[PDB]
């Protein structure tokens, strides 16, 4: 804690997780990054978003 490189790189990493939306509103520390899961990353794929929005009827159609 309070180590200069670590707090800078940590704030930068979490900020990037916020930019990606990989971490959202309710998650905001390095232990939630450990909490991150492979489905959460997969959900970021454009085909998932297209299917979710309902522009197409399925993941394959998307």
């Amino acid at each position: 804690e309070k180590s200069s490189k670590r707090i800078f790189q940590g704030e930068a990493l979490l900020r990037r997780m916020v930019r990606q939306g990989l971490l959202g509103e309710n998650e905001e520390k390095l232990d939630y990054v450990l909490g991150l899961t492979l489905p959460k990353l997969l959900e970021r794929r454009l085909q998932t978003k297209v299917f979710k929005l309902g522009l197409a009827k399925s993941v394959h159609h998307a």
């Binding site: 232990d31 450990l34 909490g35 991150l36 899961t37």
Partner: protein, 224 residues
């Protein structure tokens, strides 16, 4: 179903005078009655019913002047997935019978694990609370604590047993010849067993302990 506990302590659990397995564990009481486990880990009302799995079946043989005399040893792994593991072992001269015997043994074996945090309070005990090592024959197996999102690994058997214990994150290690599976299973169970036996700073606090079930229900035990 239909029930009848021969032991008095069993009858108390059957009635529900003893509410949970934690109290009998606290007073360290030996169990020869599977019905006690059956009552506590019932399919509904229990939050986490036990899941069983026959982990290793091996033929072993006496051999005579005449015939083989081939017996079947059976290892089964049982767990709630949240705190209570069991490794059960039975050798019998018929497979289905061996499988049943091992499951009963597993219930008798059923032990509570302790878990901890890797560091800061997350409100979920998730990994082993310290490094613990268990030995059987050649093989000595060590579970070592891991941070969150850092899932359990090992042999299939180790992976299953840790999953049965409800250990989410662990580092595993092993020393010796890993091949001997029953010894490997037993050594994992020995290591796993030590988790809720290890003295720790949190237990420095001098604290009262309750009077026995054998005195709390003494009249009820005299009664029936």
């Amino acid at each position: 179903k239909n029930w009848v506990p021969v032991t008095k302590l069993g009858r108390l659990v059957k009635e529900g005078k003893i509410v949970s397995i934690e109290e009998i564990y606290l007073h360290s009481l030996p169990i020869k009655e599977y019905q006690i486990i059956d009552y506590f880990f019932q399919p509904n009302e229990c939050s986490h019913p036990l899941k069983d799995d026959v982990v290793k079946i091996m033929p072993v043989q006496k051999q005579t002047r005449a015939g083989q005399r081939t017996r079947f040893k059976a290892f089964v792994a049982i767990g709630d997935g949240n705190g209570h593991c069991g490794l059960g072992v039975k050798c019998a001269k018929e497979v289905a019978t061996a499988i049943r015997g091992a499951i009963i043994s597993a219930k008798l074996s059923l032990i509570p694990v302790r878990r901890g945090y890797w560091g800061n309070k997350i409100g979920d005990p998730h990994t082993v609370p310290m490094k613990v090592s268990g030995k059987c024959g050649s093989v000595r197996i060590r579970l070592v604590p891991a941070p969150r999102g850092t899932q359990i690994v090992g042999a299939p058997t180790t992976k299953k047993m840790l999953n049965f214990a409800g250990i989410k994150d662990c580092f595993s290690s092993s020393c010796g010849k890993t091949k001997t599976k029953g010894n490997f299973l037993r050594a994992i169970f020995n290591a796993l067993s030590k988790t809720y036996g290890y003295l720790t700073p949190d237990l420095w606090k001098v604290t009262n302990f309750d009077k026995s079930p054998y005195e709390e229900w003494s009249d009820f035990l005299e009664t029936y």
